[PDB]
Design a protein around this ligand. Structure first.
Ligand SMILES: [Cl-]
Ligand SMILES: [Cl-]
Ligand SMILES: [Zn+2]
Ligand SMILES: [Zn+2]
Lengths: 146, 147
């Protein structure tokens, strides 16, 4: 249930942003849906695996995924945040995405790993970041891991 | 909550069966607990990743993880089931446990990959199998992963 809700949220997000990623936006209907499902599920699971790896918490942001945005902070006179530059918003060291890539090759058989890294994997990375941003997912996973 | 329940179930199972695996049974309390927690969490996540891989359903047992045990079937005159020989009860092709191994080394830093494979990884495999065996876990994973 909680897992189903999380994956549904990630798939809706992926549907909203899929047009931005050339490897995904050009796909056929059924293949696109299957790919978004794979990416959402692997993003959820791989975020959990990052969070469960001892010592994986980002050393720059200490797991928040955020840093102070200097320019915006001085412009507004209030703290304005940006993605942590080291973990790019995940808060943890990243798991290799090779299994996710292989799962996608089942649906896009001519997808090479470099084309994946440049045209599809960025959507998966965005979904992992979204796991960290969405409080429901991030908190459920934190409580489960600890 | 659902994830917490699954990981708690797997962690308690791991503690119950830890005596079978020398790579963990010799550990001290805190280290053993941390290692079993890691193994349970990765077993849950990697089982999910198997179920989410297109085409991964075991082709011999069709995902049930079970098969007829021929000899025992004929010994008792009734159909007796057994773990599928190909997936060994998981119902799916297996994810590599490389991330799980690396995570474990953070708690057992001198653990070599062969010692992992012979004395620790079997407990992780048992836990993945238990994900498939425990109806609550298997059903929640299947329902979430499938569309
Ligand atoms: Cl084969
Ligand atoms: Cl196989
Ligand atoms: Zn960071
Ligand atoms: Zn099988």
């Amino acid at each position: 249930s909680d897992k189903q809700k999380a994956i549904n949220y990630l798939m809706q997000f992926a549907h909203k942003v899929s047009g931005k990623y050339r490897g995904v936006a050009k796909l056929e209907g059924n293949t696109k849906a299957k790919v978004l499902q794979v990416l959402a599920t692997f993003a959820y699971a791989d975020y959990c695996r990052s969070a469960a790896t001892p010592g994986a918490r980002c050393r720059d942001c200490h797991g928040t995924g955020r840093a102070v945005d200097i320019a915006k902070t001085k412009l507004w006179g209030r703290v304005v945040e940006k993605e942590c530059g080291r973990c790019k918003g995940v808060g943890y060291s990243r798991m290799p995405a090779s299994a996710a890539y292989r799962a996608v090759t089942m649906l896009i058989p001519n997808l090479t790993q470099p084309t994946w890294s440049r045209t599809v994997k960025p959507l998966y990375d965005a979904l992992v970041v979204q796991c960290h941003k969405e409080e429901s997912i991030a908190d459920n996973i934190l409580n489960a891991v600890t």
